Amino acid sequence: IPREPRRIVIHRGSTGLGFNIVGGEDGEGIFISFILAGGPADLSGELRKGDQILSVNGVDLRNASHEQAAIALKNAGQTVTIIAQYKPEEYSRFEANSRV
Amino acid sequence: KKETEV
């Protein structure tokens, strides 16, 4: 998978973009934790578990809280342009950490 | 702590 930032356009199904985010706490970034099978994210085939979301419709989320990121994603409209960067090592760092 | 569906 490419590790540089990536531009991804998703067209929203009435239900949603079809993925989950964690992060946006204690200065941590916003990451994709789950991709809903059959959803827009899943069919675009571009987003992955472990992706950090750097911006949505040009709104910088590098320094965002969780709630700020959630509000941005939910309100980004029908055509959502995402800047994402694949960071498996960082995601793993958290996931391992969470297993305690 | 938090996980949100979008």
Side-chain angles (χ1 to χ4, degrees), chain A residues 17 19-21 33 66, chain B residues 3-6:
Chain A
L17 304 181
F19 64 92
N20 298 354
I21 51 166
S33 54
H66 187 87
Chain B
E3 171 154 353
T4 309
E5 196 164 352
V6 297

Side-chain angles (χ1 to χ4, degrees), chain A residues 21-24 29 31-32 51-54 61-62 64-65 69:
Chain A
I21 51 166
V22 298
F31 301 82
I32 296 178
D51 270 333
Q52 181 184 356
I53 294 170
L54 307 189
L61 298 181
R62 290 162 180 76
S65 71

Side-chain angles (χ1 to χ4, degrees), chain A residues 27 29 31-42 44-47:
Chain A
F31 301 82
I32 296 178
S33 54
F34 188 81
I35 286 186
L36 183 72
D42 179 37
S44 86
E46 294 222 64
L47 295 170

